[PDB]
Amino acid sequence: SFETRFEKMDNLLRDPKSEVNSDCLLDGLDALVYDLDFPALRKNKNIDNFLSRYKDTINKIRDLRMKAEDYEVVKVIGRGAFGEVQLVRHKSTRKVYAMKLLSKFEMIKRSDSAFFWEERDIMAFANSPWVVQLFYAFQDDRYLYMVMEYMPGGDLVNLMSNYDVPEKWARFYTAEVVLALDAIHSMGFIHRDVKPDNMLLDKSGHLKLADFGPDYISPEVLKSQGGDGYYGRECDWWSVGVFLYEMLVGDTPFYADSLVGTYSKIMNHKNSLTFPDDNDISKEAKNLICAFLTDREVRLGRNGVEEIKRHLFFKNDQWAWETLRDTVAPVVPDLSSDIDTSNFDDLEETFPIPKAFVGNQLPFVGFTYYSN
Amino acid sequence: ASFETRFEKMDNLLRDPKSEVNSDCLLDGLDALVYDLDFPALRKNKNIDNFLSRYKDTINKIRDLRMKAEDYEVVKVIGRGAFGEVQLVRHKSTRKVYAMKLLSKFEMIKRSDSAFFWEERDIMAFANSPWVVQLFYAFQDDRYLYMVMEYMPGGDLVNLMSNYDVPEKWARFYTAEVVLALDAIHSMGFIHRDVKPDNMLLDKSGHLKLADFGTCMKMNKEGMVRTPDYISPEVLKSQGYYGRECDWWSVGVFLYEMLVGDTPFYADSLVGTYSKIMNHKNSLTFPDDNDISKEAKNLICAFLTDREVRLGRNGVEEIKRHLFFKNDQWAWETLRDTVAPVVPDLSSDIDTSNFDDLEEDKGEEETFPIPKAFVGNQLPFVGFTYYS
Numbered sequence: 001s002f003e004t005r006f007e008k009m010d011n012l013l014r015d016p017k018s019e020v021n022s023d024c025l026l027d028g029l030d031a032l033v034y035d036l037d038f039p040a041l042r043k044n045k046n047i048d049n050f051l052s053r054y055k056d057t058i059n060k061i062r063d064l065r066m067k068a069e070d071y072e073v074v075k076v077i078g079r080g081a082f083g084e085v086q087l088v089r090h091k092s093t094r095k096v097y098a099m100k101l102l103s104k105f106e107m108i109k110r111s112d113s114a115f116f117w118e119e120r121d122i123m124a125f126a127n128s129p130w131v132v133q134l135f136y137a138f139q140d141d142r143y144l145y146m147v148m149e150y151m152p153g154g155d156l157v158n159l160m161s162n163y164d165v166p167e168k169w170a171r172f173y174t175a176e177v178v179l180a181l182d183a184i185h186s187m188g189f190i191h192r193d194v195k196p197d198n199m200l201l202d203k204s205g206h207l208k209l210a211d212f213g214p215d216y217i218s219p220e221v222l223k224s225q226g227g228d229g230y231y232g233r234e235c236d237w238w239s240v241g242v243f244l245y246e247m248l249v250g251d252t253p254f255y256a257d258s259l260v261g262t263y264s265k266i267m268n269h270k271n272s273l274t275f276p277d278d279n280d281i282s283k284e285a286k287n288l289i290c291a292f293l294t295d296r297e298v299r300l301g302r303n304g305v306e307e308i309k310r311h312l313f314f315k316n317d318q319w320a321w322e323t324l325r326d327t328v329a330p331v332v333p334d335l336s337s338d339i340d341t342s343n344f345d346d347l348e349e350t351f352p353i354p355k356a357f358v359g360n361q362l363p364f365v366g367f368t369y370y371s372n
Numbered sequence: 373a374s375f376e377t378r379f380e381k382m383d384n385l386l387r388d389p390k391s392e393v394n395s396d397c398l399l400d401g402l403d404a405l406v407y408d409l410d411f412p413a414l415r416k417n418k419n420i421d422n423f424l425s426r427y428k429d430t431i432n433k434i435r436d437l438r439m440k441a442e443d444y445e446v447v448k449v450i451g452r453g454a455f456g457e458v459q460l461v462r463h464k465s466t467r468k469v470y471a472m473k474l475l476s477k478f479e480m481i482k483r484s485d486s487a488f489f490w491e492e493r494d495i496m497a498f499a500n501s502p503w504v505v506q507l508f509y510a511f512q513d514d515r516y517l518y519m520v521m522e523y524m525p526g527g528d529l530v531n532l533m534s535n536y537d538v539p540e541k542w543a544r545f546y547t548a549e550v551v552l553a554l555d556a557i558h559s560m561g562f563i564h565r566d567v568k569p570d571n572m573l574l575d576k577s578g579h580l581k582l583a584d585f586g587t588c589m590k591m592n593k594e595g596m597v598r599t600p601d602y603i604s605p606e607v608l609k610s611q612g613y614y615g616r617e618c619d620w621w622s623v624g625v626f627l628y629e630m631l632v633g634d635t636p637f638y639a640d641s642l643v644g645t646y647s648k649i650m651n652h653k654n655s656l657t658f659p660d661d662n663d664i665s666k667e668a669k670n671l672i673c674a675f676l677t678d679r680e681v682r683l684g685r686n687g688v689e690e691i692k693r694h695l696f697f698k699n700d701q702w703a704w705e706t707l708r709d710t711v712a713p714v715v716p717d718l719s720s721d722i723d724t725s726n727f728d729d730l731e732e733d734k735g736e737e738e739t740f741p742i743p744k745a746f747v748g749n750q751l752p753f754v755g756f757t758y759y760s
C-alpha cells in the first residue's frame with residue numbers, strides 16, 4: 001500500500017517522540033552547516049557547493065527558530081560541572097522559566113555527550129504533577145538549552161538546612177517522593193541517584209523531581225558500575241530511605257570523610273547503619289528506613305509501590321495517597337514576585353578550527369523540542 | 373516577531389514544496405549524512421560512530437517507507453543519455469505505468485557535473501501546464517537520482533516528421549502547442565536553450581508536451597541567460613547573454629522543417645550550417661514549388677531573424693495574435709480539446725511501438741573509493757526528493 005507507507009511517514013515526521021520529527025531533521029541540517037563551514041573543509045567541492053546552496057536558508061532558519069537571545073537572563077540560580085541554571089524571562093511572552101545550559105565544549109572535551117537524552121524525554125513527556133516539565137529544548141553551536149518550569153520553592157537541601165524537620169513534614173515529603181518515583185517507574189525509567197537536590201518545590205510547596213542526567217547510591221548501583229551486575233527500580237527505593245534518614249537525623253546514614261569510606265559503609269550497610277543515641281525518631285520511621293536500607297532481595301519496593309504505601313509510617317489523619325497533592329504543604333513559599341530568588345543561594349572556550357571534518361555537532365542532533 | 377508568527381513561518385518552510393528545507397529535503401540531508409559517514413575509517417571518530425548507532429536504525433526504516441527503485445517494475449528502456457537512461461516502468465502496488473529517468477551519481481561526481489538536473493526537476497515538478505511533461509515523484513538512493521514522469525506513448529516529433537508529410541493544418545497545431553509549452557517555461561523564469569523536435573513528445577491522445585530540460589537555465593531580473601541546425605545566431609557568435617527569444621528562433625526552425633521537410637540552414641558540413649545561420653538574411657529561402665501560405669512564411673521569417681527584432685522578445689501574446697494561428701477548428705482556449713492530427717493506436721498501456729526499443733545494460737555499478745576522510749559525495753543531491 002502506497003498511501004499507508006506515505007501516512008506512516010507523516011506520523012514519524014509529526015510525532016514529538018520521533019527521532020526523525022520535523023524539528024529533529026532541522027537539527028541535522030543545522031549541525032551540518034556548523035561542522036562543514038571551515039576554510040580547510042570548503043576546499044572540497046562537495047562541501048563548498050553544499051554550503052553555498054544552504055547557508056542562506058540555514059541562517060534564516062536559525063533566526064526563526066528558538067534561540068538564547070529570545071530570553072532575558074535574570075539571575076543564575078544553580079551551577080554544575082557542564083553548565084548552569086538561569087532564571088530567565090522570555091522577551092516576547094514575559095513568562096519566567098528555569099533554563100538549564102549544557103556546554104558542548106565541556107561535553108566533547110570530557111567525552112561525555114549522551115547523558116541528557118533521558119532527562120530531556122522524562123521532562124518533556126512525563127505529563128505528571130510530580131515531574132518538572134520541559135517546555136522547550138533548543139541549541140546553538142556552543143550550548144544545549146532546556147526551558148523548564150521555575151520551581152520557586154527551592155530544593156530539599158535548602159529546606160533541610162533552614163528547618164528542623166518534624167516527622168509530620170518528613171512523612172509528607174517522603175510520600176510525595178514515593179508518588180514521584182512511581183510516576184517515573186510507570187514511564188519505564190529508573191532515576192538511579194535520587195537526592196534532595198533533585199527534589200524541587202513549586203509555588204504551593206509541593207515536590208516535583210528534576211535532574212535525570214555517592215551518599216545516596218544503593219549497593220547494587222555501586223556493584224553494577226564494575227561492569228557485571230544489574231539493578232531494578234528498588235535502587236530508587238534505597239535512595240528514599242537515605243533521604244528519610246537525612247531528614248530526621250541531620251546526616252546521611254553512610255557519611256564519611258573519604259569517598260572510599262562512604263562506598264565501604266554502603267556495602268557494609270548491615271553494620272554501618274546506626275541511629276544516634278539521642279534519637280527522638282519513632283519506631284515506624286526507623287522501621288521504614290531499615291526496610292529501604294537493606295539488600296535488594298528483601299528491600300521494600302521489590303513488590304511494587306503498594307507495600308510502601310501501606311507502611312505504618314504513612315498512617316496519618318491529614319492526608320490520603322490519592323489526594324496528597326491537594327493538601328497544604330508544610331512550607332508554602334513567600335509568593336512576592338515572579339522573579340523571587342529568596343529560596344536560592346547566589347554565586348568560555350571555543351572549539352579549535354577543524355582541519356578535517358570533526359562532527360562535534362553530531363551527538364546533539366535531535367535535541368530540539370517544541371511543546372505545542 | 374509575534375513568536376507564533378515565527379513558529380507559523382517555520383511550518384510554511386517545512387511544508388512548501390518549493391522550499392529548500394521542507395521535510396523531504398531535511399530527510400535527504402539525514403539520509404546523505406548516514407551514507408557519507410558509514411565507513412570504518414570515519415567510524416573511528418566517536419562523534420560519527422555514536423551518531424550512526426543512534427540513527428542507523430531509523431534511517432534504514434525510513435529508506436524502506438520512502439519511495440525506492442524496488443517499488444517499480446522495469447518494462448523496457450525507451451531512451452538513453454550520457455549519465456543515465458529512461459525506462460518504461462510500472463509501479464508494483466498501483467500498477468500505473470510511468471517513464472522513469474535515472475541519473476548516475478558516480479558518472480556525475482566523476483565528471484564533476486552534478487548540478488544540471490535542478491532546473492529539469494523544478495520545471496517538470498512545478499510547471500503545472502498541459503504542455504510540460506509532469507514529474508510526479510523524484511527520489512534517490514546512494515547510486516542514482518530517479519525522476520518519475522508521465523509516459524508519452526506517441527513518441528517524439530522527429531519520428532512524426534519522418535513518417536508524415538506535414539500539412540499546414542498539422543504544423544499549426546504542433547507549433548501552437550510548442551508556443552504554449554515554451555510560454556509555461558518562460559513564465560517560470562527559465563529558458564530551454566535547446567528546443568528541437570527531440571524534446572517534443574506526444575501523449576496518448578496525440579497532444580504535444582515539452583520534455584528534456586537538462587539544458588535549462590534560470591533568467592535574472594532582466595531575462596538573460598548564460599543540434600547545430602536549431603541553434604540561433606547569437607549563440608554561434610559566442611561559440612554570453614541570451615533572452616527568451618533564443619527559444620523562439622528554434623520554433624521558427626521547427627515550423628520550417630515541418631512544412632518543408634528540411635532544416636532551413638542545412639549543409640554537408642557544420643561550418644556550412646554555421647555560415648548559413650549567420651547569413652540568415654540571404655540563406656533563408658522557401659522552395660519554389662510549395663504549399664506554404666504567406667502567413668506561415670511570415671511566421672517563420674518573424675522567428676528566423678535578428679534577436680533585436682525577433683517575434684517573442686516581448687512575450688507570447690504577439691505570437692498568439694499571428695494570422696498563421698487563425699483557423700476554424702480550434703482557439704487558444706480550446707486547443708487541447710481538439711482531436712490531434714495523429715492519435716496513436718495503442719495495443720496496451722505498455723505499447724512502445726512509437727520508440728526504438730533499446731537493449732538494457734545492467735553492468736557498470738563502478739566504485740567511488742571508500743572514503744578515508746569525509747568526502748560528502750551525497751551532499752550535491754540533498755533536496756532532490758519530491759512527492760506530488
Ligand SMILES: CN(CC(=O)N1CC=C(c2c[nH]c3ncccc23)CC1)c1ccccc1
Pocket residue numbers: 077078079080081082083084085098100101102132148149150151152200210211212213
Ligand atoms: C545543577 N544542575 C543539575 C540539573 O540538571 N538540574 C537541577 C534542577 C533543575 C531545575 C528545574 N527547574 C528549576 N527551577 C529552579 C532551579 C533549578 C531548576 C534542572 C535539573 C546542572 C548540572 C549540570 C549542568 C547544569 C546544571
Ligand SMILES: CN(CC(=O)N1CC=C(c2c[nH]c3ncccc23)CC1)c1ccccc1
Pocket residue numbers: 450451452453454455456457458471473474475505521522523524525573583584585586
Ligand atoms: C534522453 N535524455 C533526455 C531526457 O532527460 N528526457 C527524454 C525523455 C523523457 C521522457 C519523459 N516521458 C517519456 N515518455 C516516453 C519517452 C520518453 C520520456 C524525459 C526527459 C536523457 C539524458 C540523460 C539520461 C537519461 C535520459
